[PDB]
Design a binder for this molecule. Structure first.
Ligand SMILES: Cc1cc2nc3c(=O)[nH]c(=O)nc-3n(C[C@H](O)[C@H](O)[C@H](O)COP(=O)(O)OP(=O)(O)OC[C@H]3O[C@@H](n4cnc5c(N)ncnc54)[C@H](O)[C@@H]3O)c2cc1C
Ligand SMILES: Cc1cc2nc3c(=O)[nH]c(=O)nc-3n(C[C@H](O)[C@H](O)[C@H](O)COP(=O)(O)OP(=O)(O)OC[C@H]3O[C@@H](n4cnc5c(N)ncnc54)[C@H](O)[C@@H]3O)c2cc1C
Ligand SMILES: Nc1ccn([C@H]2C[C@H](O)[C@@H](COP(=O)(O)O)O2)c(=O)n1
Ligand SMILES: Nc1ccn([C@H]2C[C@H](O)[C@@H](COP(=O)(O)O)O2)c(=O)n1
Lengths: 234, 234
């Protein structure tokens, strides 16, 4: 029976449990926009100890932590010079290029950083000043991104939907809602970025960290990555 | 031990199980923006049979289905004449009034309907024409709503974050992500609206319905409603 709720002590244990479940007990085996994948709809993953966002198993190597840290610095700095930030990574070129279509502006991008930066002042104020607020939600995916749907663009239509932060009894709790998660590869990056971001937020607020929840409307592993996943299970 | 994952056959069974768990095994007992409540962070609720969105127990009566249907017609019609639509319900007046602050425009509102209406053409096209798309996400809560955070407005800062639809093997699956859920009262309305909306979407696409997932970053019951909840449990 497909297990959709996964609670783990640390990010790596969650990572491995999620990938094992998608490989072994998929809800769907489906031909997607970018190839065949095993998929579980609406997975919920809980990580008890979010400081563990850098996974230790060197076999989980498709996202190097050099790349993850460069991505983090690029994202938290809120800039748009992705060509410079990622010049050492030619394979990401199709995700950082200028919009081809005249429909949306040439300054249009779907980088998370500028959106986080735009919302940080209002969201930090709420998080710091309104006790026990439920209102602190970073919007990543935007309805204005829907202009990408019927286009030939290669820009990311944001896989991350929103990140909610809330503080109870001195601890920061985090809920990252993913529209779409490549659980074998990109989730290593997403776990790193979300781990860094929540510690950034917790430090800004002067609070300690509670736990981390990761919901994924589509949690998938592409068939082309099954061997890679098997390489780090066991 | 606090149960955060609840799977139920129908909306009412989920409703009762969620409320029982918040009352009996809260994660937090917290003083919120609008009073003390029991709370469970990041609850996931699965409803197997989403046609059941009208609950049958007449003791669950704080959201009348006359009101719920009027709300539905108002929302799906995409209009902004809330004063007319809800004239028979004086108690909702503070949620439908014009913005008081000069900061945001006087046409500003947080009604779901116009936002659903704005996104329906692009999202239906994706849902109908891109096979096995993961991209169909109705954004409800918007970052532009953050202008409400440091204001004295009584308008709803959207409790509903997003609603994701996807189709696999002839069936529509729905994932409603709630930022904030009053599980005893308003969740009856939210279940009704989301049940109606997903059947609207499924009919537009000519597909049958799969199941419904409801995630809630804050799932709470106000202490002032504990007696009401106890009245419909058992
Ligand atoms: C701003 C930004 C947005 C991004 N958005 C997304 C996104 O939405 N989705 C996403 O998936 N990634 C996205 N990325 C990229 C992501 O961060 C990772 O770089 C990527 O997921 C790595 O996947 P991969 O290991 O398959 O690398 P890839 O670059 O896809 O593959 C590794 C390289 O090795 C080659 N290769 C290795 N073995 C073989 C073989 N046997 N046969 C043929 N070729 C082989 C491949 O051809 C390829 O060039 C984004 C990056 C940036 C900077
Ligand atoms: C566009 C829109 C947006 C909305 N947004 C929200 C929202 O964000 N959050 C939300 O909670 N609701 C919201 N609502 C309202 C919601 O849809 C329901 O109407 C509401 O949640 C009903 O809650 P209630 O049963 O506590 O009713 P209430 O109106 O809160 O209470 C019932 C009435 O009975 C009175 N009453 C009954 N018994 C007693 C007693 N013993 N002592 C004193 N007074 C008593 C109360 O004073 C009150 O007037 C919205 C409505 C609309 C139309
Ligand atoms: N931060 C991100 C951005 C994207 N993706 C993945 C999910 C899909 O594998 C693909 C996006 O394709 P789609 O838009 O069809 O869901 O990239 C991811 O896992 N994490
Ligand atoms: N569709 C909606 C809109 C709002 N609320 C509830 C959640 C909170 O009880 C309150 C919103 O307050 P807050 O913004 O502080 O979360 O209304 C809800 O349950 N469903």
């Amino acid at each position: 029976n497909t297990m959709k709720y996964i609670k783990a002590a640390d990010f790596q244990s969650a990572f491995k449990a999620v990938n094992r479940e998608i490989l072994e007990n998929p809800q769907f085996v489906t031909d997607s926009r970018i190839g065949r994948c095993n998929e579980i709809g609406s997975m919920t993953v809980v990580v008890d100890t979010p400081s563990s966002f850098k996974m230790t198993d060197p076999r989980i190597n498709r996202i190097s932590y050099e790349y993850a840290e460069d991505f983090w610095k690029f994202m938290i700095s809120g800039g748009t010079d992705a060509k410079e930030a990622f010049k050492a990574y030619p394979n990401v070129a199709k995700f950082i290029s200028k919009p081809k279509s005249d429909a949306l502006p040439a300054n249009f991008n779907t980088f998370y950083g500028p959106r986080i930066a735009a919302q940080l002042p209002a969201l930090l104020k709420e998080l710091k000043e309104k006790p026990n607020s439920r209102r602190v939600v970073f919007q990543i995916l935007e309805s204005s991104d829907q202009a990408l749907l019927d286009s030939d663009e290669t820009l990311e239509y944001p896989c991350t939907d929103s990140v909610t932060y809330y503080i109870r009894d001195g601890k920061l709790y985090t809920h990252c809602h993913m529209r779409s998660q490549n659980c074998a590869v990109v989730m290593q990056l997403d776990f790193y970025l979300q781990g860094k971001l929540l510690h950034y937020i917790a430090n800004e607020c002067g609070v300690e960290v509670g736990d981390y929840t990761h919901t994924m409307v589509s949690a998938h592993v592409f068939e082309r990555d099954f061997d890679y996943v098997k390489g780090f299970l066991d």
